[PDB]
């Protein structure tokens, strides 16, 4: 399954003036473009090698679309402040996520077009791409206006047409990068706890994509209900890391095995410390 997704953030900042406006595009959870109103000459920019084949009409049109979007978001921030009757000198956030999930056959799996105001759901295009979930009265007011403007029809045209078409083009152009798999490299560490037992920590490093399953086993039985597990985190070079740990009796460490499952592995890994 594949996705094209844009993540848009507009932040009002009274007293310094005009909102900070950003726009980050991902293909299959891989960043490939960005826009930042705080650049000295703000414009759409490549953030992956493969998108750089696009002609300058692509970059000029995306720059203009971002700047146009920035205009709408400036208006929306004023509209929201009034509808929620918020104080005039404060900073507020309008977020927007839009995109398409498609199978290999190119069928649209799910289109998204949803907004949040100060961190909570505001309005969201439903999966039928004809109706809106509106969280409160201000967003219900927005929905009535969008219903009589035919917005859903026309956003759905983007999600079913231009979004799928460009995704399909991106997967051809960026095939070697997006479909790459990087297998985890794993090791187990050990540290005596002040309590008198032992922490075994199973590391997975250098893997892509981010989806991974780490489990500890004690003579073949899963210890999910007794393990610690960090949020998967970016290494900064395009790979990810994660670890999982268990607390074990000193002297029984060799009974415990780490299990690493990742799409880049031909067979799951099994590691011990003793």
């Amino acid at each position: 399954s594949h996705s094209l997704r844009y993540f848009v953030t507009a932040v009002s900042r009274p007293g310094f003036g005009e909102p900070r406006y950003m726009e980050v595009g991902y293909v299959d959870n891989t960043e490939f473009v960005r826009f930042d109103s705080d650049a000295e000459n703000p414009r759409y920019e490549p953030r992956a090698r493969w998108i750089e084949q696009e002609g300058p009409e692509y970059w000029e049109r995306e720059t203009r679309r971002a700047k146009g979007n920035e205009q709408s978001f400036r208006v929306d921030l004023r509209t929201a402040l009034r509808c929620y009757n918020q104080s005039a000198g404060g900073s507020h956030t309008l977020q927007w996520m839009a995109g398409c999930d498609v199978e290999s056959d190119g069928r649209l799996l799910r289109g998204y077009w949803q907004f949040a105001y100060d961190g909570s759901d505001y309005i969201a295009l439903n999966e039928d791409l004809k109706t809106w979930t509106a969280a409160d009265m201000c967003a219900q007011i927005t929905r009535r206006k969008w219903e009589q403007a035919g917005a859903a029809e026309r956003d759905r045209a983007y999600l079913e047409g231009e979004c799928v078409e460009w995704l399909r083009r991106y997967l051809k152009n960026g095939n070697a990068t997006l479909l790459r798999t990087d297998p985890p490299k794993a090791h187990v560490t050990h540290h005596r706890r002040p309590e008198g037992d032992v922490t075994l920590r199973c590391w997975a490093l250098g893997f892509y994509p981010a989806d991974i399953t780490l489990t500890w086993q004690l003579n073949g039985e899963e210890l999910t209900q007794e393990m610690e597990l960090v949020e998967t985190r970016p290494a900064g070079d395009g790979t990810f890391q994660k670890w999982a740990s268990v607390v074990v009796p000193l002297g029984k460490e060799q009974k415990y095995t780490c299990h690493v499952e990742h799409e880049g592995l031909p067979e799951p890994l099994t590691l011990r410390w003793g």
Binding site: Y6, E23, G25, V33, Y58, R61, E62, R65, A66, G68, N69, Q71, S72, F73, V75, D76, T79, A80, L94, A98, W113, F115, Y122, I123, A139, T142, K145, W146, A149, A151, R154, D155, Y158, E162, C163, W166
Partner: peptide
């Protein structure tokens, strides 16, 4: 390519 708000404001 990304989506346009097209001055369809909230």
């Amino acid at each position: 390519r990304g989506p346009g708000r097209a001055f369809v404001t909230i």
